[PDB]
Amino acid sequence: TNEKQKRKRQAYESNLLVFVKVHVLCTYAEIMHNPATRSRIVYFILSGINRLVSSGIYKAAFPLERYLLYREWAHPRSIYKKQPLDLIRKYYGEKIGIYFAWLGYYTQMLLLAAVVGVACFLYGYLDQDNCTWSKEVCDPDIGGQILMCPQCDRLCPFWRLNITCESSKKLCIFDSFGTLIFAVFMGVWVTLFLEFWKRRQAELEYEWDTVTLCASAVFFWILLIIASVIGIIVYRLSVFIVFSLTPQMATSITASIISFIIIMILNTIYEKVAIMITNFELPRTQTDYENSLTMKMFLFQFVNYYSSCFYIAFFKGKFVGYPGDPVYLLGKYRSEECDPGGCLLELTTQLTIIMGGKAIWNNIQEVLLPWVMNLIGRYKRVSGSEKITPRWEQDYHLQPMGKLGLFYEYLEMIIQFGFVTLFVASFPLAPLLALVNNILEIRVDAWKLTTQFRRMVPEKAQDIGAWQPIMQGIAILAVVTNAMIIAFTSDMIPRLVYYWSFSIPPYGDHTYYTMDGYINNTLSVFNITCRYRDFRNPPGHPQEYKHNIYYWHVIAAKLAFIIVMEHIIYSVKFFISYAIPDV
Amino acid sequence: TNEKQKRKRQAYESNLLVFVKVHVLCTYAEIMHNPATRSRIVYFILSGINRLVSSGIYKAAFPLERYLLYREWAHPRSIYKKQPLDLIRKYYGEKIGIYFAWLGYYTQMLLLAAVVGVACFLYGYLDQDNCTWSKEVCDPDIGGQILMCPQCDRLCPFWRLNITCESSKKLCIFDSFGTLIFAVFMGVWVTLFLEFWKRRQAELEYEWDTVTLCASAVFFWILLIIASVIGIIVYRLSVFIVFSLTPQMATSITASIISFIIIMILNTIYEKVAIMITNFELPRTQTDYENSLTMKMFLFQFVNYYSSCFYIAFFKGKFVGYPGDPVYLLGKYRSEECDPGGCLLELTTQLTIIMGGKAIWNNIQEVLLPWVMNLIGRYKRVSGSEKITPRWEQDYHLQPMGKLGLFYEYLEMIIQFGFVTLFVASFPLAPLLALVNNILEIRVDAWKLTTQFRRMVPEKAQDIGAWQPIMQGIAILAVVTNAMIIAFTSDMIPRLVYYWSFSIPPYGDHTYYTMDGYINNTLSVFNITCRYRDFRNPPGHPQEYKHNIYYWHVIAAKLAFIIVMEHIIYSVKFFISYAIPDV
Ligand SMILES: [Ca+2]
Ligand SMILES: [Ca+2]
Structure with a gap:
C-alpha cells in the first residue's frame, strides 16, 4: 500500500522524510480579491487536501512581526x-x-x-x-428565634435561624x-x-x-x-x-x-x-x-x-x-x-x-x-x-x-x-x-x-x-x-413589596416607609400537623396551604418586572438601536 | 416675470399652450441597470424638475395592456x-x-x-x-337581581342587571x-x-x-x-x-x-x-x-x-x-x-x-x-x-x-x-x-x-x-x-380562573369543573357608606377596598398570559422563522 498511495500523491505535485517547501505567484492574486498574505495565496493555490491528509497519504500540510x-x-x-x-x-x-x-x-x-x-x-x-x-438576621434576638422546618426527610434537624448569618451578613x-x-x-x-x-x-x-x-x-x-x-x-x-x-x-x-x-x-x-x-x-x-x-x-x-x-x-x-x-x-x-x-x-x-x-x-x-x-x-x-x-x-x-x-x-x-x-x-x-x-x-x-x-x-x-x-x-x-x-x-422583589405594601397601615403596622422587621413577616408557618420558604395560607385558614394575597401580590410583582424590565429594556434595545451615531 | 422665467425654461430644452411630446434612447439604458419601461427611461433622461414645476415655470410634466x-x-x-x-x-x-x-x-x-x-x-x-x-345574565332570576352601583356623579340611576342582555347575549x-x-x-x-x-x-x-x-x-x-x-x-x-x-x-x-x-x-x-x-x-x-x-x-x-x-x-x-x-x-x-x-x-x-x-x-x-x-x-x-x-x-x-x-x-x-x-x-x-x-x-x-x-x-x-x-x-x-x-x-381570563380556581372546593362550592354561577361570584360589593366592576375587599374586611386574593390571582393570570402567550408566540416567531422552507 506504500506504492499504492505513492502514485496518487505524485500526480498532485505535477500541476505546480524531507519536508517540502513552497513558493505564477501574481497570477492567483486576481482570482481572489506580507508573509501572512503570502501564506494566504499559496493556500489558494493549495485549494483540495480535505481528504488526502485525512486519509493518511500526507501527514501535515502547513505554513511557516514575530519579534x-x-x-x-x-x-x-x-x-x-x-x-x-x-x-x-x-x-x-x-x-x-x-x-x-x-x-x-x-x-x-x-x-x-x-x-x-x-x-x-x-x-x-x-x-x-x-x-x-443583616441587622435582624444577625442580631440573634430578632433573627435568632426563627425556628424553621426541615427540608429533607431523614438525617435532618428541626433547624433554627442564626445559623444563617455568615451567608446572610455578606x-x-x-x-x-x-x-x-x-x-x-x-x-x-x-x-x-x-x-x-x-x-x-x-x-x-x-x-x-x-424532519x-x-x-x-x-x-x-x-x-x-x-x-x-x-x-x-x-x-x-x-x-x-x-x-x-x-x-x-x-x-x-x-x-x-x-x-x-x-x-x-x-x-x-x-x-x-x-x-x-x-x-x-x-x-x-x-x-x-x-x-x-x-x-x-x-x-x-x-x-x-x-x-x-x-x-x-x-x-x-x-x-x-x-x-x-x-x-x-x-x-x-x-x-x-x-x-x-x-x-x-x-x-x-x-x-x-x-x-x-x-x-x-x-x-x-x-x-x-x-x-x-x-x-x-x-x-x-x-x-x-x-x-x-x-x-x-x-x-x-x-x-x-x-x-x-x-x-x-x-x-x-x-x-x-x-x-x-x-x-x-x-x-x-x-x-x-x-x-x-x-x-x-x-x-x-x-x-x-x-x-x-x-x-x-x-x-x-x-x-x-x-x-x-x-x-x-x-x-x-x-x-x-x-x-x-x-x-x-x-x-429583593419581596423586599420591595414589604417596603412598599406591607409596612403601610394596610396589611402592616408602621407609620412611614421603613424596612424594619422583615423575616418574621414574610414566610408561612406550617403546623406540627415552623416556617418554610414559601407563601401559603397558614394552617387554620379559610383555604389553608394554598397561596396568600402576598404570594399572588409578589408573583404579580414578579411577573411585572418580567414584563416591565423586559418592555423597558426591550425598548432601550429599540431606542439605542435607533438613536446612536453610526460613524 | 413672463419673459424672466421664459429664458430659464428654454435653456433646459437645449440639451435634449401646446403640450410637449417626448421620445440616444438606447444610450441611457446602460447608465441604469415596453411602454412602462419606455416611460421609465425618459424619466431617467428627465432627471431635475423638483424645483421647476414647484416654482411654477412649468405646470405638469407627465407620462402617457390597458384593454x-x-x-x-x-x-x-x-x-x-x-x-x-x-x-x-x-x-x-x-x-x-x-x-x-x-x-x-x-x-x-x-x-x-x-x-x-x-x-x-x-x-x-x-x-x-x-x-x-348568556344563561345567568339573561335568565332574569340569576342575573336579574344584580343591583349595581352608578358610574357617573349626576343624572345617574342606581342601576340594575337584566338591562345588559342585548349586549351580553351576543x-x-x-x-x-x-x-x-x-x-x-x-x-x-x-x-x-x-x-x-x-x-x-x-x-x-x-x-x-x-437632539x-x-x-x-x-x-x-x-x-x-x-x-x-x-x-x-x-x-x-x-x-x-x-x-x-x-x-x-x-x-x-x-x-x-x-x-x-x-x-x-x-x-x-x-x-x-x-x-x-x-x-x-x-x-x-x-x-x-x-x-x-x-x-x-x-x-x-x-x-x-x-x-x-x-x-x-x-x-x-x-x-x-x-x-x-x-x-x-x-x-x-x-x-x-x-x-x-x-x-x-x-x-x-x-x-x-x-x-x-x-x-x-x-x-x-x-x-x-x-x-x-x-x-x-x-x-x-x-x-x-x-x-x-x-x-x-x-x-x-x-x-x-x-x-x-x-x-x-x-x-x-x-x-x-x-x-x-x-x-x-x-x-x-x-x-x-x-x-x-x-x-x-x-x-x-x-x-x-x-x-x-x-x-x-x-x-x-x-x-x-x-x-x-x-x-x-x-x-x-x-x-x-x-x-x-x-x-x-x-x-375570559377571569372566566378561566373561576372555572379552574374558584369552583374547586378551595374558595368554591362545587364538585367538578363547571362554569355555573359566575357574575354574583366575581365582582366586589360597595356599601352605602352594590357591586362595581373591580376586585377589592368588601367594606368590613381586615383591609377593606384594597384588593383581594382574586384581583391579585387574576392579575397574576393576566400578567402570566402577557408573559406566556408572549414567550410562546414570541418563540413561534423564533421557530417558524427558523424552520420553514425558503424555496
Ligand atoms: Ca484560551
Ligand atoms: Ca385606496
Missing part, C-alpha cells in the same frame, strides 16, 4: 498602553483578530461594568447601617440596594455591549477588508438534557450526606467542585456524540460542519454548564405542597427544597466556580500542558535575525489545531459571556473577576498563539458569524433571566 | 380566477405592484383567518347551551370559547402573515428585478397626543347627556360615529402640522421626506385612530378607588368607569366603525369624488385600437398624484392591518369584513388606477421599505395588545 509582538503585546512585562490590534491584522489576520479585538473591547467594556460592579460593594462596604437583612452586598442598580444596568449593559460592538465591528469592518434525521438529533438529546439535571443532584446526594468556612461556605465551594468534575467529564462525551450523530446522515460540505456544532455542540455545553445553573435558578425551590409536599419525583423518594436567604448564594458560588474555575483551569490547562513557560525563551533572539534556516527541519514536534480553529477557544468565552450576563443579579464583581482574567487571557491566548502553536492559516473571516445568533439568542434569554433571577431567584 | 386589464381584473364582472399580478409588472410596475400583490396575498391570507373567524361563530351559533354568560360569540382559539391563532397569524410574506416577497423579489430640533418635534407632540385622548371623551360628554337598538346598541353606533367625524377633522390638521415642523429645520434630500412621514405622519394617525382605542382598551376602567374613587382628573370633576360585561363590546364597535367605516368611506370617497362610475365607459373601445391621437390634447383635466404616491392609499391599509391584528380578541369576522372589502378594494383601487388617475411614473421600488419597521413594530406591539386585550379588556 516586536513578543514585547509590547505578549510579554508578561507589557505595560498597559494600547493593545495594538492593527498588528494582528498583519500578524495573524482576521479569524484570530476578530477574537482579539473582541476581547480588547470586551475588557474595556467590562471596565465600566466593574465600576458599577464596585458600586454594589463601594457603598456596600463603606456603610454600616443595614436595614434588616448577602446584603449581593441583595441590598446596588443589585437593582447594576442588574438594571447589566440588561442595559448587554444591550449596550451588543449595539456598541455592532458600531465597533462595523468600525472594525471599515478598518479591515470587508426525521433532525428529530432523533433532538429527541435523543432530551434524554441527555435530563442527564445534566441528574448530574448535579446525585453528587448533591453524595456530599451533603458525608458532611452533615465550615457551616455551608466551604460546602458550597465543595459541592460545586464535585459537579464541576462531572461537568468536564460529560464534556468529553459531548465531543464524542456530536460526531456520532453527524457522521450518520447528511455529512455535507465544508461550512455546515461548524453550523452543526453551533447548533449541537455549543448546545451540548449550554445544557452541560447551564442546565444545572438553570436548576438552582428556575426549578429548585418549587412545588412545596400541603404537608410540605414535594412531587415525590413520580417515584418513591422525596424531592428537595431551598433555604430562606433567597436561593442565589448557592447559585452565586456555582456562578463563581463554574466561571472563575474555568478561567483558572482552561487557561492554566493551556499553560501547563505546553510545558510550563520560559524554558529559555522560544526564538526571540533570531526573530530579528530570521536566519534559523533549519527551522522547517525543527518543526513537526509542535502541536497543530484539531481542524477546529478558534471554536474551542471561542466557545469557552461565550460560556464566560453567558455567565457575565445571563446570571448576573448577584455578584457584581463578575466583571472585575473577568476584568483581570481578560487582562491575563488576552496575554496567555496571545502568548500561545505567538509562541506555542503552529501558525494558523490566516483564514479571512468577516464577522463572528455563527455565534452571532447565539449572542442575540443569549441576550434575549438574558433579559428574561436577569429578570427571572430577581423574580424567581433573589429576594 | 385586457379592464376585463379580467378591473371589471365588476371579473370572476375570481387568478388576479394576474404579472400584468401589473408590465402595466404599472412595482411601486404599485408591491401593493397589489400585497393585497392579493393579504386577501387569501385573510381567507384562513376568516374560517377561524367563522369558527367563533359557527359553533357560536349552532350550539344552544351557554354556560353562564357577547358569548365574542367572549365564550373561540376567542382564545382565534386570538391565539391571530398572534400566530400575524407571526405567520409576516414570515410567509417574507417568503412571498422574496418569491416576489425572485419573480421581479431585485434639539427633534426634541420639540416630540415634546410638542405629547400635547397633541393628549389632544386625541380628549377628542373622544368630550364628545362622550355630549352624546351620553342628550340621550340618557335603543339601550346602548344604537348609542355605541352613534357615539363612535361622532368621534369618527372629529377623527377625520384632526386628520386634516395632521396634514398641516407635519409640513409646519419639517419646513423649519433640516428639510434635506429626496428620501428623508418619506422617512419623516413614516416617523411623524403615520405616527400622527397612530395617535389619531388608536390613542382613543387605546383609551377603551388600556386606560378606561382603571383607578376606581375607595368611595368608588376616581382620580378626579387632578381637577374638580369626576372621572369615568366601565361596565360589567368586559369593556370590549364598547371597543368592538369602535373597532368596527373605525375600520368598517373607513372601508365604507375611504373607498367610497374614491368612488363618488371621481364622478360616479360608468359615465359611458372610459376609453376601452379604442384601447384595442390606440388611435385617439388628440389624447395628449384631452388631458390636463385629469387628477394627478399630490407628490406622494401610494403613501395615502398605503397608510389607510396599514391602519386596517393595525385593526385586523392589534385589536383582535373580539370580533373574529374582522377578517371576513376585511375579506369582502379586500375583494372590493382590490377592484376599486384597481379601477381608479386603470381608469381614473393620470398614469403614475413606474418607480421601481424593491420592498415595502419604510412601513416594514412598522409592520414589525405593530406585530411586536400586537402580541402585547392581543394579550393585553384578553388580559386588561376581555373577561
Whole structure:
C-alpha cells in the first residue's frame, strides 16, 4: 500500500522524510480579491487536501512581526498602553483578530461594568447601617428565634435561624440596594455591549477588508438534557450526606467542585456524540460542519454548564405542597427544597466556580500542558535575525489545531459571556473577576498563539458569524433571566413589596416607609400537623396551604418586572438601536 | 416675470399652450441597470424638475395592456380566477405592484383567518347551551337581581342587571370559547402573515428585478397626543347627556360615529402640522421626506385612530378607588368607569366603525369624488385600437398624484392591518369584513388606477421599505395588545380562573369543573357608606377596598398570559422563522 498511495500523491505535485517547501505567484492574486498574505495565496493555490491528509497519504500540510509582538503585546512585562490590534491584522489576520479585538473591547467594556460592579460593594462596604437583612438576621434576638422546618426527610434537624448569618451578613452586598442598580444596568449593559460592538465591528469592518434525521438529533438529546439535571443532584446526594468556612461556605465551594468534575467529564462525551450523530446522515460540505456544532455542540455545553445553573435558578425551590409536599419525583423518594436567604448564594458560588474555575483551569490547562513557560525563551533572539534556516527541519514536534480553529477557544468565552450576563443579579464583581482574567487571557491566548502553536492559516473571516445568533439568542434569554433571577431567584422583589405594601397601615403596622422587621413577616408557618420558604395560607385558614394575597401580590410583582424590565429594556434595545451615531 | 422665467425654461430644452411630446434612447439604458419601461427611461433622461414645476415655470410634466386589464381584473364582472399580478409588472410596475400583490396575498391570507373567524361563530351559533354568560345574565332570576352601583356623579340611576342582555347575549360569540382559539391563532397569524410574506416577497423579489430640533418635534407632540385622548371623551360628554337598538346598541353606533367625524377633522390638521415642523429645520434630500412621514405622519394617525382605542382598551376602567374613587382628573370633576360585561363590546364597535367605516368611506370617497362610475365607459373601445391621437390634447383635466404616491392609499391599509391584528380578541369576522372589502378594494383601487388617475411614473421600488419597521413594530406591539386585550379588556381570563380556581372546593362550592354561577361570584360589593366592576375587599374586611386574593390571582393570570402567550408566540416567531422552507 506504500506504492499504492505513492502514485496518487505524485500526480498532485505535477500541476505546480524531507519536508517540502513552497513558493505564477501574481497570477492567483486576481482570482481572489506580507508573509501572512503570502501564506494566504499559496493556500489558494493549495485549494483540495480535505481528504488526502485525512486519509493518511500526507501527514501535515502547513505554513511557516514575530519579534516586536513578543514585547509590547505578549510579554508578561507589557505595560498597559494600547493593545495594538492593527498588528494582528498583519500578524495573524482576521479569524484570530476578530477574537482579539473582541476581547480588547470586551475588557474595556467590562471596565465600566466593574465600576458599577464596585458600586454594589463601594457603598456596600463603606456603610454600616443595614436595614434588616443583616441587622435582624444577625442580631440573634430578632433573627435568632426563627425556628424553621426541615427540608429533607431523614438525617435532618428541626433547624433554627442564626445559623444563617455568615451567608446572610455578606448577602446584603449581593441583595441590598446596588443589585437593582447594576442588574438594571447589566440588561442595559448587554444591550449596550451588543449595539456598541455592532458600531465597533462595523468600525472594525471599515478598518479591515470587508424532519426525521433532525428529530432523533433532538429527541435523543432530551434524554441527555435530563442527564445534566441528574448530574448535579446525585453528587448533591453524595456530599451533603458525608458532611452533615465550615457551616455551608466551604460546602458550597465543595459541592460545586464535585459537579464541576462531572461537568468536564460529560464534556468529553459531548465531543464524542456530536460526531456520532453527524457522521450518520447528511455529512455535507465544508461550512455546515461548524453550523452543526453551533447548533449541537455549543448546545451540548449550554445544557452541560447551564442546565444545572438553570436548576438552582428556575426549578429548585418549587412545588412545596400541603404537608410540605414535594412531587415525590413520580417515584418513591422525596424531592428537595431551598433555604430562606433567597436561593442565589448557592447559585452565586456555582456562578463563581463554574466561571472563575474555568478561567483558572482552561487557561492554566493551556499553560501547563505546553510545558510550563520560559524554558529559555522560544526564538526571540533570531526573530530579528530570521536566519534559523533549519527551522522547517525543527518543526513537526509542535502541536497543530484539531481542524477546529478558534471554536474551542471561542466557545469557552461565550460560556464566560453567558455567565457575565445571563446570571448576573448577584455578584457584581463578575466583571472585575473577568476584568483581570481578560487582562491575563488576552496575554496567555496571545502568548500561545505567538509562541506555542503552529501558525494558523490566516483564514479571512468577516464577522463572528455563527455565534452571532447565539449572542442575540443569549441576550434575549438574558433579559428574561436577569429578570427571572430577581423574580424567581433573589429576594429583593419581596423586599420591595414589604417596603412598599406591607409596612403601610394596610396589611402592616408602621407609620412611614421603613424596612424594619422583615423575616418574621414574610414566610408561612406550617403546623406540627415552623416556617418554610414559601407563601401559603397558614394552617387554620379559610383555604389553608394554598397561596396568600402576598404570594399572588409578589408573583404579580414578579411577573411585572418580567414584563416591565423586559418592555423597558426591550425598548432601550429599540431606542439605542435607533438613536446612536453610526460613524 | 413672463419673459424672466421664459429664458430659464428654454435653456433646459437645449440639451435634449401646446403640450410637449417626448421620445440616444438606447444610450441611457446602460447608465441604469415596453411602454412602462419606455416611460421609465425618459424619466431617467428627465432627471431635475423638483424645483421647476414647484416654482411654477412649468405646470405638469407627465407620462402617457390597458384593454385586457379592464376585463379580467378591473371589471365588476371579473370572476375570481387568478388576479394576474404579472400584468401589473408590465402595466404599472412595482411601486404599485408591491401593493397589489400585497393585497392579493393579504386577501387569501385573510381567507384562513376568516374560517377561524367563522369558527367563533359557527359553533357560536349552532350550539344552544351557554354556560353562564348568556344563561345567568339573561335568565332574569340569576342575573336579574344584580343591583349595581352608578358610574357617573349626576343624572345617574342606581342601576340594575337584566338591562345588559342585548349586549351580553351576543357577547358569548365574542367572549365564550373561540376567542382564545382565534386570538391565539391571530398572534400566530400575524407571526405567520409576516414570515410567509417574507417568503412571498422574496418569491416576489425572485419573480421581479431585485437632539434639539427633534426634541420639540416630540415634546410638542405629547400635547397633541393628549389632544386625541380628549377628542373622544368630550364628545362622550355630549352624546351620553342628550340621550340618557335603543339601550346602548344604537348609542355605541352613534357615539363612535361622532368621534369618527372629529377623527377625520384632526386628520386634516395632521396634514398641516407635519409640513409646519419639517419646513423649519433640516428639510434635506429626496428620501428623508418619506422617512419623516413614516416617523411623524403615520405616527400622527397612530395617535389619531388608536390613542382613543387605546383609551377603551388600556386606560378606561382603571383607578376606581375607595368611595368608588376616581382620580378626579387632578381637577374638580369626576372621572369615568366601565361596565360589567368586559369593556370590549364598547371597543368592538369602535373597532368596527373605525375600520368598517373607513372601508365604507375611504373607498367610497374614491368612488363618488371621481364622478360616479360608468359615465359611458372610459376609453376601452379604442384601447384595442390606440388611435385617439388628440389624447395628449384631452388631458390636463385629469387628477394627478399630490407628490406622494401610494403613501395615502398605503397608510389607510396599514391602519386596517393595525385593526385586523392589534385589536383582535373580539370580533373574529374582522377578517371576513376585511375579506369582502379586500375583494372590493382590490377592484376599486384597481379601477381608479386603470381608469381614473393620470398614469403614475413606474418607480421601481424593491420592498415595502419604510412601513416594514412598522409592520414589525405593530406585530411586536400586537402580541402585547392581543394579550393585553384578553388580559386588561376581555373577561375570559377571569372566566378561566373561576372555572379552574374558584369552583374547586378551595374558595368554591362545587364538585367538578363547571362554569355555573359566575357574575354574583366575581365582582366586589360597595356599601352605602352594590357591586362595581373591580376586585377589592368588601367594606368590613381586615383591609377593606384594597384588593383581594382574586384581583391579585387574576392579575397574576393576566400578567402570566402577557408573559406566556408572549414567550410562546414570541418563540413561534423564533421557530417558524427558523424552520420553514425558503424555496
Ligand atoms: Ca484560551
Ligand atoms: Ca385606496
